Design a protein around this ligand. Structure first.
Ligand SMILES: N[C@@H](CC(=O)O)C(=O)O
Ligand SMILES: N[C@@H](CC(=O)O)C(=O)O
Ligand SMILES: N[C@@H](CC(=O)O)C(=O)O
Ligand SMILES: N[C@@H](CC(=O)O)C(=O)O
Lengths: 326, 306, 306, 326
């Protein structure tokens, strides 16, 4: 059977509360060993080996843990047949895209979490973790980029996102759909991401100590410019706008970001709306302002790529093409 | 036929006399309140709107507000809390330009008037009418950046559907709206200042710090997951909450409630959970909450009733 | 604590004492009505169920029926029309086996009892509780073949959501249910025979002809699109409708209403449109309709009220 | 500019009523010329040429019009750059899969319809037809199988289905998602169907006068066996079961179909549930009864493939593998 390495980072999957029937819980508590041992059918499918990288709620996820992950995967690739990453749900979609863009290891990387704590009634984490291992074990799982496996479904790291605050079925690829569904330890793959991932990207984080500073500002009625001016004041390399409708900006925020674009700060228009693309050739003349439209990337996802794009270039045409390729 | 007033505010739907069939169903009069893209919607326009409706209630049988799509869901919930008129107030926009192939606005307009003119639309609170669907102003939101079908009530579903100029209503909002709220805006010309801050991995506390240093009355967090806060942001908001800033935890996730009794002790920090109100909606309620009270506990009870 | 009765009927959820925490919230007693996979659910079981509930109403504070997922949506709507008891009747199943990794049944059961035991669950009609959600028995249906999240109220949304053993209710069904229906099943031991036929390109009229030649009391069509009929099937049903067979046009499409005033003159052929009732749900109502009347017009008014 | 051939078959796209504001209408009325001329921007993107094959509502769609379509496309391929097929909505998802399995022409085939009649206020048909032509005109549209284009979205012929009786946004690929979204006459493709289509299939309808007879039976509580016995009585080559939950059968229907399988009639278990697969290795021992599980194919779609499978083989193992390949 295949050798699978579990890289644990915390999350509710490793979370606990004092009642099986109360919602209250704390994160970053339980070690990887408890998790493996809570799925004594893992023996049937793989030779599992658990390593604890960090133990944090993914709400406190950060650039350094991302860097740690990518270098460790890229370093350890020759040592295992596959990777599963146990992680909190909240920022799983950010980390999954980060690794999707930066892992060069040609073996599957499957992220997994849980929407109920390990201690809860009908906790979702055991079966999720099993299906993660199945997916990382499956030869057909290779050359699909970095994956998330939640609720019996294999979802590509780019499109994958939370749709609901609490639903075990929360994770969906809301724009282009899942890669495959899982039944009885077997996967019927009908799709693969077309945008470039993993070893077909330029992004090489092996020698990086940090990542460019990119912030996110929200739009809404009577929006303040003070958040945008804060980030510009602090010399942020990039700002992503979580726009209204199709990436549109409140006039005060617009004005601030327009000025910023012209002094070298990279500016990406995304949208606070949960599906569909922030397009070029709508209400914002991007070329004029030196803005970038995010396409289907939501604000937190557009942040990931803009940060990586800023390790290669500061030219907004080069960054726009990156946002059309990756 | 009923008398129906259009209150125009701009939006893509204007960019009456193109829809001659409205004569079949109502006597309409149009009145320009403002003319702006709703990405630039603001407190003053909202205040004008609520006041106008409240004042002109008796003089018409229902209201249709033409509006941009970008922020219609916000203007909708504001009016849903502030309109005291018991006659239908119906909002409508268009996702395609007035001059484009298969423009949605005409039939959208048509159906908004059908809804405004239906006696059973009464006492359901302020409504959004888009894509043959009647949607309550609290839960209504955009789902897609460009889809004509974008407006959905994503947590509790629509009030009804519109076919052949009739509506089969199957639901009404339970949360208190319009004349059952204590919010009264008739004497106000500014609203408490309330900002939104975004959470994500390695989130800067800079936005939150900048609203705190401006003396904002409230801050809505667009949390990760079930309304969770990146550590720097958590730290800044925890301070804000005891230093005279109201603090609502909402979510960047498009559906489900930001709940109490998960990972954050709201009571200890003095925070409020938004329930199913997304960050822009939680803002609206928060502004109006702040006209009644500054106590977190009292603000939590408002977020629980409305 | 309230008294809550489980009425067991089989299903995957059994394949009480595994859920010791139910003692925290109720005093339960269990009673085996039948033990079958719900793919074999039938009229007799339905009749037993309605009678049992109606009779034992006064003796308990609410009801939880454990059931297969396959046809729970049918049993749900049957009971929603026939239960006269005003106390909560809550249905629950499980999409994963009782012995499987992360089985859903325990917490499903738990939450069904929370719902059965909530005083605000009263007078909302018969309910399905699945995946932390309360769902009205009329609109509730499967969306997915294996997903734990499969049960949704696909046209009008859920009644509420369940978190930390409390429900925030935001909606109630408007269509008349339970004690507001004229259906009374207390003296019946068979139901009018009603069949379903499927439409698609080059559809055979053979199924429809075979139910007609058996003297069926009704036929539900699973139409294409907005309840449209392949020509052969149309021809057979048109004949049936004037020869003493009730004919309801529903749709194979999972959402939206099968409407009047589209391409079919229902009045001319003597047909009924199902509105939002899918074919299996339209069947239920049709059966009960046929215990009151055989006139199409009267049957259309029932499909419009319930 | 590209040469595009419009093959008209009727539908509401070519439907009309006497009021712009009433729902009533009749189908199979308006010719292809009115349609082209109702989109006077078609000039900007292609040299269009309209041919009327039939003029029917798609509720009266049938095997012979399918056969006509496939032979005509396969015959005329060298004469145009692309095909658009105007068709009713109701059975578009059946015809799109039929052609997906039987077109050998290596140029795009794009189906399009409309949920409001041509005469209606804000009728959807003009813009749909424009986006159909854009899609058929796009070089990137090739090697994706037969497509449907509705509401600004490009959907693969296999997964595409109606989700709502009346919504202009009704058509979705409910299991695996769309191929691409359309903005301002341009398409950003991120997916292609993995299952075998067009010239990578065995199905060759060039010399076929008819198709094997396959019927569909519905399951529900207290289901009658009389529909199933009718089709078996008439010597049907195949029966598809629109099962309950995961392809399950009411015991009377089961019994009839079990008997039928054993006397040579092909039997496919599908599901009346609108998403997710009818799986092997659940509550039905398929191998034992000589049944076939449909996977993600819904009843009407499983009918299409079972009919084509029955032009090649009657062996239920061969048909099961076809249902795993196509
Ligand atoms: N806050 C948790 C939520 C979860 O994992 O379910 C996390 O993302 O770490
Ligand atoms: N930006 C426009 C979008 C629209 O209405 O379609 C507005 O909201 O004013
Ligand atoms: N066939 C089973 C499916 C389940 O309950 O999960 C039943 O309905 O009895
Ligand atoms: N019955 C029509 C419906 C439509 O096209 O909108 C058809 O499929 O032909």
């Amino acid at each position: 059977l295949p050798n699978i390495t579990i890289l644990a980072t915390g999350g509710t999957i490793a979370g606990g509360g004092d009642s099986a029937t109360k919602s209250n819980y704390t994160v970053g508590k339980v070690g990887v060993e408890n998790l493996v041992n809570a799925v004594p059918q893992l023996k049937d499918i793989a030779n599992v080996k658990g390593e604890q990288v960090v133990n944090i709620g993914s709400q406190d996820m950060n650039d350094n843990v991302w860097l740690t992950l990518a270098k460790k995967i890229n370093t350890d690739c020759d040592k295992t047949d596959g990777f599963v990453i146990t992680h909190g749900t909240d920022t799983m979609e950010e980390t999954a895209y980060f690794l999707d863009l930066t892992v060069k290891c040609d073996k599957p990387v499957v992220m997994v979490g849980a929407m109920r704590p390990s201690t809860s009634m009908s906790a979702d984490g055991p079966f999720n973790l099993y299906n993660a291992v199945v997916t990382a074990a499956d030869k057909a799982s290779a050359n699909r980029g970095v994956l998330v496996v939640m609720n019996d479904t294999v979802l590509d790291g780019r499109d994958v996102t939370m749709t609901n605050t609490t639903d075990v079925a929360t994770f969906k690829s809301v724009n282009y759909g899942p890669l495959g569904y899982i039944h009885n330890g077997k996967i019927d793959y009908q799709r693969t991401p077309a945008r470039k991932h993993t070893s077909d990207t330029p992004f090489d984080v092996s020698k990086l100590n940090e990542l460019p500073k990119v912030g996110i500002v929200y739009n809404y009625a009577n929006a303040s410019d003070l958040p945008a001016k804060a980030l510009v004041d602090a010399g942020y390399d990039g700002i992503v706008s979580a726009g209204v409708g199709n990436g549109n900006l409140y006039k005060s925020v617009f004005d601030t970001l327009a000025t910023a674009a012209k002094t070298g700060t990279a500016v990406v228009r995304s949208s606070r709306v949960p599906t569909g693309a922030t397009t070029q050739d709508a209400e914002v003349d991007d070329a004029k302002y030196g803005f970038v439209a995010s396409g289907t990337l939501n604000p937190q996802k557009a942040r990931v790529l803009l940060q990586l794009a800023l390790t290669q270039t500061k030219d907004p045409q080069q960054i726009q093409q990156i946002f059309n390729q990756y």
